[PDB]
Design a protein around this ligand. Structure first.
Ligand SMILES: Nc1ccn([C@H]2C[C@H](O)[C@@H](COP(=O)(O)OP(=O)(O)OP(=O)(O)O)O2)c(=O)n1
Ligand SMILES: Nc1ccn([C@H]2C[C@H](O)[C@@H](COP(=O)(O)OP(=O)(O)OP(=O)(O)O)O2)c(=O)n1
Ligand SMILES: Nc1ccn([C@H]2C[C@H](O)[C@@H](COP(=O)(O)OP(=O)(O)OP(=O)(O)O)O2)c(=O)n1
Ligand SMILES: [Mg+2]
Ligand SMILES: [Mg+2]
Ligand SMILES: [Mg+2]
Lengths: 193, 193, 193
């Protein structure tokens, strides 16, 4: 079961969840809240490493991640990020989202973007109970044209699903959770497994 | 919850939910209804533009979309569409689906297709409450072999999820909704943002 | 509605849902159970066929699938599977999952893996009511770096959703279901449509 729009307006009013800044009524409809693109990005520098050993020694993996991740890219007023075909890039939502322990969220892209090949997640679209922060986007252009991405554009949508009860280990309280406090286009922390 | 098969049917029998043509009992099972491939398609003509400015002047964006989108391709009797690796294409379901205001739908592909790299959407698989029309598919072949797609084949599945209450702004009543009355392989309408 | 962590443990304790071997308490949190990577894999040999006719004559599609699928790869001690960008591969979960008729499951990847371009499904991530078996993974590396995959690593997550009632035609009792008794990195069986 997903919250319908009116109830998404209720839970937000009651402080039962937060979306900050709160999108206006034109962006909350059906069973979703549209979210917008942030202004921070990250690309990959493949020429500095041969591969990433996903569950290899913690040192080697971290040293490798730091080599291949560009610094954070902050776009000027007016400026675009050009996502070319076959290029993976990290980005972030403009909105911070905060979920309570008895709610899980789900990130969709958009059908208009799908029809041009833009994926807004790479089979990871769950926003956990107790989550609090801006959502990091993993963009991939699977289409035939480069796509200019500009801060503020509508980039996806969130839907919300009550859990069967409150989670006993929500994200804000789990010791080995990787992405609390995340505020920009944060790189993989697979090294922390 | 999602509706189980008997409850999917019950909803079809009451007429709230509607699928046209209605698939037989052999294609409604577990918590899904199988859907089939239509006969309309669209490809991209990248050579006529440099890029698409997703958030750029409305006039630029439409003019560019019209140049890159092919003529609808209509396949007659057992003609195939050849989806080659790395090629994004648009297609449609054979079935029209109509949802009421208190229900949201979700499009899956198929495991058998996944194992050959066929994606049936590009992180956009929500069918909204109030939606009424054929579903546009954004195909991408991520595998190593070209795949021949024929009309009538089983291409995906739908599951259905009651909302917490009836949506106040369902898709059929919302004024800036892009894809009401969708009956073929309709191209992106990101220009109408 | 998804089961929260305490409710997942309760259903495991009841036994009609089951995950063998059962992951410890550290791996069940929020609304998910983490799953791990198994030791069996498959690649494609494209050089033996021109294409696969998804709904062409049964005997010629079974012949083509047998020619393009490698036999099963079983990795030796401390050995890795190297997933190069743009290469599709099949794998399997370490865990066997068994769901009852009144429950559907959903496979996520991981945000840490998404941020390096690793997809763990190809728009097919529904685990059906009545399902029983190891889950076959369709991996694709959409990133810039090859990724070394080692058995035992955390590869994804499962969430669980009660159905409106028990399915009348769950997966275990359905005569044209393709993937019961599924043990390794089983190849597409699209030829059985
Ligand atoms: N594979 C898909 C997914 C969705 N849709 C349809 C069903 C939805 O109810 C509708 C809108 O989905 P989105 O909100 O993701 O699309 P947009 O945001 O691009 O359009 P809109 O401005 O109308 O919200 O399009 C479709 O035809 N094919
Ligand atoms: N990543 C995944 C997703 C699903 N499955 C399994 C779980 C499902 O219960 C089953 C069927 O999934 P689909 O209906 O998507 O696959 P098909 O339609 O190709 O098979 P079938 O004809 O049996 O419905 O396969 C899997 O092993 N790995
Ligand atoms: N597109 C997404 C999807 C998820 N997340 C956030 C929301 C989740 O609550 C969190 C964790 O998601 P995963 O469990 O899939 O990520 P990991 O397993 O890699 O991290 P962890 O070790 O914290 O479980 O990351 C995000 O920023 N962007
Ligand atoms: Mg929308
Ligand atoms: Mg199926
Ligand atoms: Mg996780």
């Amino acid at each position: 079961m997903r919250l319908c729009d009116r109830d998404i307006e209720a839970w937000l009013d009651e402080g039962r969840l937060s979306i900050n800044p709160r999108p206006p009524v034109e962006r909350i409809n059906g069973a979703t809240v549209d979210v917008r693109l942030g202004n921070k990005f990250r690309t990959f520098r493949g020429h500095t490493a041969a591969f990433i050993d996903l569950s290899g020694p913690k040192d080697e993996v971290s040293a490798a991640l730091d080599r291949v991740m560009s610094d954070e890219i902050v776009l000027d007023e007016g400026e675009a990020f050009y996502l070319h075909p076959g290029e993976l890039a990290l980005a972030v939502t403009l909105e911070s989202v905060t979920l309570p322990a008895d709610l899980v969220g789900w990130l969709d892209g958009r059908s208009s973007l799908a029809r041009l090949g833009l994926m807004v997640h790479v089979t990871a679209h769950r926003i956990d109970p107790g989550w609090s922060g801006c959502i990091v986007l993993a963009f991939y252009n699977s289409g035939k044209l480069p796509l200019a991405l500009r801060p503020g554009m509508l980039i996806g949508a969130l839907s919300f699903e009550p859990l069967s009860g409150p989670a006993v280990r929500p994200y804000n309280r789990r010791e080995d959770a990787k992405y609390r406090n995340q505020q920009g286009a944060v790189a993989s922390r697979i090294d922390k497994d």
